[PDB]
Design an enzyme around this catalytic site. Structure first.
Site, mmCIF file in Angstrom:
data_model
loop_
_atom_site.group_PDB
_atom_site.id
_atom_site.type_symbol
_atom_site.label_atom_id
_atom_site.label_comp_id
_atom_site.label_asym_id
_atom_site.label_seq_id
_atom_site.Cartn_x
_atom_site.Cartn_y
_atom_site.Cartn_z
ATOM 1 N N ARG A 1 -16.212 -17.661 43.261
ATOM 2 C CA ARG A 1 -16.680 -17.261 44.529
ATOM 3 C C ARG A 1 -18.126 -16.799 44.420
ATOM 4 O O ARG A 1 -18.464 -16.031 43.574
ATOM 5 C CB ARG A 1 -15.791 -16.188 45.099
ATOM 6 C CG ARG A 1 -14.400 -16.658 45.422
ATOM 7 C CD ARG A 1 -13.455 -15.579 45.883
ATOM 8 N NE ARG A 1 -12.084 -16.058 45.888
ATOM 9 C CZ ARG A 1 -11.036 -15.403 46.337
ATOM 10 N NH1 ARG A 1 -11.141 -14.236 46.868
ATOM 11 N NH2 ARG A 1 -9.890 -15.954 46.271
ATOM 12 N N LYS B 1 1.402 -10.689 56.814
ATOM 13 C CA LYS B 1 1.376 -10.389 55.382
ATOM 14 C C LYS B 1 1.842 -8.982 55.054
ATOM 15 O O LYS B 1 1.917 -8.129 55.926
ATOM 16 C CB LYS B 1 -0.030 -10.592 54.814
ATOM 17 C CG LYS B 1 -1.017 -9.524 55.255
ATOM 18 C CD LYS B 1 -2.383 -9.739 54.634
ATOM 19 C CE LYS B 1 -3.412 -8.837 55.284
ATOM 20 N NZ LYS B 1 -4.777 -9.114 54.768
ATOM 21 N N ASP C 1 -1.714 -15.875 40.351
ATOM 22 C CA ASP C 1 -1.489 -16.520 41.607
ATOM 23 C C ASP C 1 -0.222 -17.343 41.596
ATOM 24 O O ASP C 1 0.128 -17.899 40.591
ATOM 25 C CB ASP C 1 -2.666 -17.389 41.956
ATOM 26 C CG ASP C 1 -2.773 -17.692 43.412
ATOM 27 O OD1 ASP C 1 -2.269 -16.983 44.247
ATOM 28 O OD2 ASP C 1 -3.410 -18.656 43.725
ATOM 29 N N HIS D 1 2.716 -19.569 44.555
ATOM 30 C CA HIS D 1 3.053 -20.012 45.882
ATOM 31 C C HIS D 1 4.497 -20.450 45.900
ATOM 32 O O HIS D 1 4.953 -21.194 45.027
ATOM 33 C CB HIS D 1 2.120 -21.136 46.324
ATOM 34 C CG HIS D 1 0.672 -20.743 46.307
ATOM 35 N ND1 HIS D 1 -0.150 -21.006 45.241
ATOM 36 C CD2 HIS D 1 -0.074 -20.079 47.219
ATOM 37 C CE1 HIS D 1 -1.364 -20.533 45.502
ATOM 38 N NE2 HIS D 1 -1.341 -19.971 46.688
ATOM 39 N N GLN E 1 -6.733 -15.114 38.776
ATOM 40 C CA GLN E 1 -5.676 -14.541 39.602
ATOM 41 C C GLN E 1 -4.332 -14.779 38.951
ATOM 42 O O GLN E 1 -4.114 -15.819 38.340
ATOM 43 C CB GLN E 1 -5.662 -15.190 40.991
ATOM 44 C CG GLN E 1 -6.493 -14.488 42.056
ATOM 45 C CD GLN E 1 -6.353 -15.143 43.421
ATOM 46 O OE1 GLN E 1 -6.180 -16.358 43.520
ATOM 47 N NE2 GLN E 1 -6.419 -14.340 44.477
ATOM 48 N N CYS F 1 -4.465 -22.478 45.784
ATOM 49 C CA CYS F 1 -3.438 -22.934 46.727
ATOM 50 C C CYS F 1 -3.419 -24.450 47.023
ATOM 51 O O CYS F 1 -2.362 -25.092 46.903
ATOM 52 C CB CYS F 1 -3.493 -22.110 48.024
ATOM 53 S SG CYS F 1 -4.685 -20.741 47.992
ATOM 54 N N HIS G 1 1.950 -17.226 49.799
ATOM 55 C CA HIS G 1 1.009 -16.883 48.747
ATOM 56 C C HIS G 1 1.454 -15.550 48.180
ATOM 57 O O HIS G 1 1.714 -14.622 48.934
ATOM 58 C CB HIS G 1 -0.400 -16.712 49.316
ATOM 59 C CG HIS G 1 -0.913 -17.899 50.058
ATOM 60 N ND1 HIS G 1 -1.792 -18.810 49.497
ATOM 61 C CD2 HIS G 1 -0.709 -18.325 51.327
ATOM 62 C CE1 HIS G 1 -2.085 -19.739 50.375
ATOM 63 N NE2 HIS G 1 -1.440 -19.470 51.504
HETATM 64 C C1 2CR Z 1 -9.696 -21.240 54.346
HETATM 65 C C2 2CR Z 1 -9.121 -19.899 54.758
HETATM 66 C C3 2CR Z 1 -10.015 -18.744 54.332
HETATM 67 C C4 2CR Z 1 -9.722 -17.425 55.012
HETATM 68 C C5 2CR Z 1 -9.998 -17.513 56.498
HETATM 69 C C6 2CR Z 1 -10.513 -16.310 54.377
HETATM 70 C C7 2CR Z 1 -10.130 -14.896 54.801
HETATM 71 C C8 2CR Z 1 -11.164 -13.954 54.268
HETATM 72 C C9 2CR Z 1 -8.788 -14.363 54.341
HETATM 73 O O1 2CR Z 1 -7.774 -14.684 55.229
HETATM 74 C C10 2CR Z 1 -8.449 -14.838 52.954
HETATM 75 C C11 2CR Z 1 -7.115 -14.417 52.388
HETATM 76 O O2 2CR Z 1 -6.513 -13.484 52.716
HETATM 77 O O3 2CR Z 1 -6.635 -15.175 51.352
HETATM 78 C C12 2CR Z 1 -5.427 -14.803 50.807
HETATM 79 C C13 2CR Z 1 -5.560 -14.636 49.304
HETATM 80 C C14 2CR Z 1 -4.200 -14.413 48.684
HETATM 81 C C15 2CR Z 1 -4.437 -13.625 47.432
HETATM 82 C C16 2CR Z 1 -5.619 -12.759 47.777
HETATM 83 C C17 2CR Z 1 -6.460 -13.530 48.762
HETATM 84 C C18 2CR Z 1 -7.635 -14.108 48.066
HETATM 85 O O4 2CR Z 1 -7.490 -15.055 47.377
HETATM 86 O O5 2CR Z 1 -8.716 -13.645 48.260
HETATM 87 C C19 2CR Z 1 -4.322 -15.802 51.113
HETATM 88 C C20 2CR Z 1 -4.653 -17.134 51.698
HETATM 89 C C21 2CR Z 1 -4.995 -18.270 51.138
HETATM 90 C C22 2CR Z 1 -5.162 -19.202 52.219
HETATM 91 C C23 2CR Z 1 -5.394 -20.459 52.495
HETATM 92 C C24 2CR Z 1 -5.605 -21.417 51.763
HETATM 93 N N1 2CR Z 1 -5.833 -22.381 51.236
HETATM 94 C C25 2CR Z 1 -5.410 -20.672 53.973
HETATM 95 O O6 2CR Z 1 -4.492 -21.662 54.303
HETATM 96 C C26 2CR Z 1 -6.788 -20.937 54.533
HETATM 97 C C27 2CR Z 1 -6.697 -21.134 56.019
HETATM 98 C C28 2CR Z 1 -7.693 -19.767 54.258
HETATM 99 ZN ZN ZN Z 2 -2.976 -19.085 47.636
#
Ligand code: 2CR
Ligand code: ZN
Ligand code: 2CR
Ligand code: ZN
Lengths: 401, 401
Positions: free
Chosen positions: A122, A224, A142, A144, A140, A93, A270
């Site tokens: 990761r 979402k 992926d 946006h 992914q 992203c 996303h």
């Molecule tokens: C740094 C933050 C981490 C977040 C708190 C982790 C959580 C576990 C969860 O909210 C993650 C999430 O749903 O990500 C999901 C992704 C989408 C596909 C699957 C999941 C994936 O990739 O895994 C979407 C968000 C990406 C987000 C950002 C970026 N950059 C945010 O702006 C940023 C604030 C995220």
């Molecule tokens: Zn993303």
């Protein structure tokens, strides 16, 4: 129905302790992966997505600005150069936003859809690692979408269609959609959230989808919807997501000139359909139990001979089938014919073309399938035509039904 | 002819301080990259290479085994998980060997050709970084050939042919070749080196290639051939290499069953044609001065309308050409025709099609080029066929050139 077992049996991939959670893709498995890539790219074309490539790692300051340092820290691999810390990207992203930020954007540039086959890493705990399904390194599907508020609904609708499109190709028509709404504390105004949540709900209802609500289960940065597919064993796999983000574009200073000639911050979405493509390959491997639809099959055709009298002929055919864009191998070894047929049947090769003296004479091929069917004697060009249709259509089913 | 300037002007890529020496590929640049990948893959199919994918990082023990810790330490990015140290791969070779080591091999499997578009990261000094040409992250058109001693010559021959094939596609006919032989101390016997060096030399001679010996300039692990193309400015670019390795396979315990059923260690050949594909894109960008051949052009065709009245028509053509496998965009903007023509001329779009009322009436298109050649009013299917022929042949020159 273990994708690891089938994976070993079909020589798709392997993993080692020197790279935990990281796949070594052999030729055949990688062929499957690449066909997946091709399909996704056809979808990107159709649905009008750009395709980009982001850098493998970025400076720690960036990942602080995105919030990953605060919420992603343990999951991220860090490395350094010349007294500067870098994180290997867990997500694509921020890179996409970095690309967006190059050049002045206006409303005329929106919606802007940007896709990548994003290599993410990761640092998952070793004990939680399973096969292709829970991994350290992955790719992914992926994307946006940068749009106006007014565009959101339409774009969501576009994603929904894409999901049901793509899943349908693999034979998953049983899908559950969950809409996660605002947590008690969030980024973004009540109004923005009302609008976005309503956009999701309406987009779903327009597609006639009886979605389930997860109340208050949305992220702090946005609401979402998530897509869960059911396989032939009726076990659930959560794969696709469409996720609104109000946090990211603001923190990275994304903006565009509005129609009113004033500064606007783009809405960000996303979206992913397959999710991890490795994991999705595992899922498919188990769904098909190793019998991949011909378009996905590493080796689509094996042409075999009884004696060497047919060898030449076989080779001819082989080249021909290879020139027609089919993945074909010749099996020339001296072994009984039934031997070859059984071996390639266990390798899940969709079609086995047997050449004896009569086939050579008649300019034909005796057609067999991995399902154990005898399709009888066939004209070579007819076979090529049918195979080409099966592949081009990405048909789930083989010939004769 | 600065590839960085042209790169910015054509919106191919960009780079930032938060990711030094690592490319953000925009849509068009990435389109170029992917097209290169398509070409290379056609080659891999023709010359019969497997294509695999290795892990992005491996544990430090492996990189110690290979010798990278001893000779490559400063150029490697390191990162850790659960008190284990990993290196991000500077090279794809050990991964390929790891893949080779899966399953028992016999002489029947040789020669085994294994290719990858290998993503590599090297920690180059920041002061040395230039554009696409000197970078931290790059992708090699990397391959490794596992063969017997008796096969070496033949395989080397194949490589040479590959090189001259590929280079000539891009219009590089001027190629200087250098053969580097044994240094004073080396891995492998005098006899091994005699045989390898003779194989390289004779390989070159039989292809009627004049070459120069660089004495003692061979690696300690093997002799090599290097290929330097010359551009239209007569500038030298070293790109291709064929490198014997007597070190890697024994260090990683590569082996196969010989005809005598005795354990043999395979000969290894590193080969790369383009080298870094990013760098090769810089090189081509400068060679063509931003005028990419139609097959490489990010946007092959732009279809413009004079007024709203042709919009519909344009759209219809745009889909048609799109379904015909052409990269085509429609410019429907509310701007004068000269504005559009100028922008797409600056973008070096090979073909600009204009639709006026005459064209909508006649079912034709007005055709002009980025060179400012007016090809005039042509039947759509003719244009399509001609474009498709230009693309399939990967022609260097356009219509009427
Ligand atoms: C740094 C933050 C981490 C977040 C708190 C982790 C959580 C576990 C969860 O909210 C993650 C999430 O749903 O990500 C999901 C992704 C989408 C596909 C699957 C999941 C994936 O990739 O895994 C979407 C968000 C990406 C987000 C950002 C970026 N950059 C945010 O702006 C940023 C604030 C995220
Ligand atoms: Zn993303
Ligand atoms: C750890 C060692 C590093 C070596 C001494 C660094 C030198 C600067 C040079 O010899 C590298 C070289 O020519 O590599 C070249 C590659 C081929 C394409 C371009 C070049 C490339 O990738 O840059 C080939 C060798 C790869 C070698 C190995 C591996 N694994 C060797 O077994 C191992 C002994 C190499
Ligand atoms: Zn190598």
């Amino acid at each position: 129905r273990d994708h690891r077992k089938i994976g070993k049996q079909l020589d798709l991939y392997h993993m080692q302790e020197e790279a935990p959670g990281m796949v070594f893709w052999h030729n055949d498995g990688w062929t499957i992966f690449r066909e997946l890539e091709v399909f996704v790219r056809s979808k990107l074309k159709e649905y009008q997505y750009q395709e980009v490539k982001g850098p493998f790692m970025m400076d720690r300051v960036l990942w602080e600005k995105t919030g990953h340092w605060d919420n992603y820290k343990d999951a991220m691999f860090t490395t350094s150069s010349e007294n500067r810390e870098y994180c290997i990207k867990p997500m694509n992203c921020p890179g996409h936003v970095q690309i967006f930020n190059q050049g002045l954007k206006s409303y005329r540039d929106l919606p802007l859809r940007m896709a990548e086959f994003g290599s993410c890493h990761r640092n998952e705990p070793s004990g939680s690692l399973h096969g292709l399904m829970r991994v350290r390194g992955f790719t992914q599907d992926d994307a946006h979408i940068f749009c106006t508020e007014e565009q959101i609904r339409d774009e969501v609708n576009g994603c929904i269609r894409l999901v049901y499109d793509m899943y349908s190709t693999f034979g998953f028509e049983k899908i559950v959609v969950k809409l996660s709404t605002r947590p008690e504390k969030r980024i973004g105004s009540d109004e923005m959230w009302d609008r976005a949540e309503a956009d999701l709900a309406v987009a779903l209802e327009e597609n006639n989808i009886p979605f389930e609500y997860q109340l208050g289960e949305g992220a702090f940065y946005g609401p979402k919807i998530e897509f869960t597919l059911y396989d032939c064993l009726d076990r659930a796999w959560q794969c696709g997501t469409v996720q609104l983000d109000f946090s990211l574009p603001s923190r990275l200073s994304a903006s565009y000139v509005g129609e009113d000639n004033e500064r606007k911050v783009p809405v960000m979405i996303h979206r992913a359909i397959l999710g991890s493509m490795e994991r999705f390959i595992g899922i498919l491997t188990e769904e098909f139990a190793g019998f991949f639809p011909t378009w996905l099959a590493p080796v689509q055709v094996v042409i075999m001979n009884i004696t060497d009298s047919q060898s030449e002929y076989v080779n001819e055919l082989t080249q021909k089938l290879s020139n027609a864009g089919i993945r074909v191998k010749a099996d020339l070894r001296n072994e009984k014919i039934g031997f070859k047929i059984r071996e390639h049947t266990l390798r899940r090769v969709p079609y086995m073309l047997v050449c004896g003296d009569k086939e050579v004479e008649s300019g034909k091929v005796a057609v067999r399938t991995r399902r154990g069917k005898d399709l009888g004697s066939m004209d070579v060009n007819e076979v090529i035509e049918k195979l080409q249709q099966e592949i081009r259509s990405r048909s789930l089913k083989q010939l004769e039904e």
